[PDB]
Write a protein that binds this ligand. Structure first.
Ligand code: NA
Ligand SMILES: [Zn+2]
Lengths: 4, 422
């Protein structure tokens, strides 16, 4: 996942 | 090439590598057209409304309720032309990844990482777990079960929420018990993220418009790294997080980042995981591998007829790099385990892929996205296997000019700004  | 065939979405189904399939989502679904691009790896050019029957609505919720970093478009990937471009884009990224030694190493580990056959109730028989398979419609219209390791599928409602998804087990935690499970990566090669060249700006939620574009190959590689951890069942429990204390903006909001994400990014981010806990995890998975070795020792018979008992026991001997004594029992060698564990967790990282691709990229996972761009990497005049956006022998070859959205503006259309919305 990419995140913020 | 990693993908020996240049598939076209409209190519007729053959029931082998181009076929209508159904996935084991424990629910009902109409078959979807899929393409097998490499041994154990399939691509489904559809929005993912299947792996999670509760996320089958692509329609954008009310404008009033929709978090910061997200992008909705219920129509994306609904036409044959889009699916054709999606297939070609995903294929191109696999080739870009495979063209590097690191990518070749990672993809090889992924193909060898067949999910463990631990779906039997009797410890004397080896049986496959059906959720690590897909049902392929054969030419005669009948379904046949095929084991696979990886599926690349389009995103669900939130187009930019890329992630690895896999079917769980009633009792076994397949991604954390060494077994492994088929990985479904929600991903799109048709969009990318904008970041900033200055660290102080990139890690600040109030600054930057997203001057540079992330190379989609890195984004896919990031997900493939997670897939690698999960296929070997060594993913870190998402509850194990780092209470970010190195970014005032993360801190003021008490944001936490999982160790699994820090490990995957690598570089200095990986250092936020203390030695004490790293040792804990390492020992935990070493023991899990030990259990797999013992389960294989007790296996006296095999269920099905897709392979011989000797073949499957050897398949996992190679996957887990187990040792075999005079008698014929398997055991886990400390050196070999540490080498494999280290390869999957420290060699395969986002930071290392950046070094191999020679691209500009976020310097840390602990930043703030600036924007999302629409792109098209299929045309060679836009993106290549060898150089990504920074095409050699052109004005885009140096200084990451190809990723510079201001210089190479014809290759990026900003769809949404995230800055100021956190
Ligand atoms: Na966030
Ligand atoms: Zn991630």
């Amino acid at each position: 996942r990419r995140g913020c | 090439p990693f993908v020996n065939k240049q598939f076209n979405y409209k190519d007729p189904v053959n029931g082998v590598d181009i076929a209508y399939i159904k996935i084991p989502n424990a629910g009902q679904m109409q078959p979807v057209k899929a393409f097998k691009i490499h041994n154990k790896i399939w691509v489904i050019p559809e929005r993912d409304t299947f792996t999670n029957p509760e996320e089958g609505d692509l329609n954008p919720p009310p404008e009033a309720k929709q978090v910061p970093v997200s992008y909705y478009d219920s129509t994306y990937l609904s036409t044959d032309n889009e699916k054709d471009n999606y297939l070609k884009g995903v294929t191109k990224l696999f080739e870009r990844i495979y063209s590097t030694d690191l990518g070749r190493m990672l993809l090889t580990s992924i193909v060898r990482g067949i999910p463990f056959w631990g779906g039997s109730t009797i410890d004397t028989e080896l049986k496959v777990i059906d959720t690590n398979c897909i049902n392929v419609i054969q030419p005669d219209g009948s379904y046949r079960s095929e084991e696979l390791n990886l599926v690349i599928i389009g995103p669900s409602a939130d187009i930019i929420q890329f992630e690895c998804k896999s079917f769980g087990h009633e009792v076994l935690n397949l991604t954390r018990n060494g077994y492994g499970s088929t990985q479904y990566i929600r991903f799109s090669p048709d969009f990318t993220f904008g970041f900033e060249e200055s660290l102080e700006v990139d890690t600040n939620p109030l600054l930057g418009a997203g001057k540079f574009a992330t190379d989609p190959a890195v984004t896919l590689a990031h997900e493939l790294i997670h897939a690698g951890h999960r296929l070997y069942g060594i993913a870190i429990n998402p509850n194990r997080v780092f209470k970010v204390n190195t970014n005032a903006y993360y801190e003021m909001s008490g944001l936490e980042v999982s160790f699994e994400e820090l490990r995957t990014f690598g570089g200095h981010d990986a250092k936020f995981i203390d030695s004490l806990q790293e040792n804990e995890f390492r020992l935990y998975y070493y023991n899990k591998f030990k259990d797999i070795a013992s389960t294989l020792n007790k296996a006296k018979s095999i269920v099905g007829t897709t392979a011989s008992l000797q073949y499957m026991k050897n398949v996992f001997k190679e996957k887990y790099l187990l040792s075999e004594d005079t008698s014929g029992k398997f055991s886990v060698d400390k050196l070999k385990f540490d080498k494999l564990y280290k390869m999957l967790t420290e060699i395969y990282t986002e930071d290392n892929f950046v070094k191999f691709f020679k691209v500009l990229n976020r310097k840390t996972y602990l930043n703030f996205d600036k924007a999302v761009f629409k792109i098209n990497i299929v045309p060679k005049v836009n993106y290549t296997i060898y150089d990504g956006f920074n095409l050699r022998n052109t004005n885009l070859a140096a200084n990451f000019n190809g990723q510079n959205t201001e210089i190479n503006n014809m290759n990026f259309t900003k769809l949404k700004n995230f800055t100021g919305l956190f």
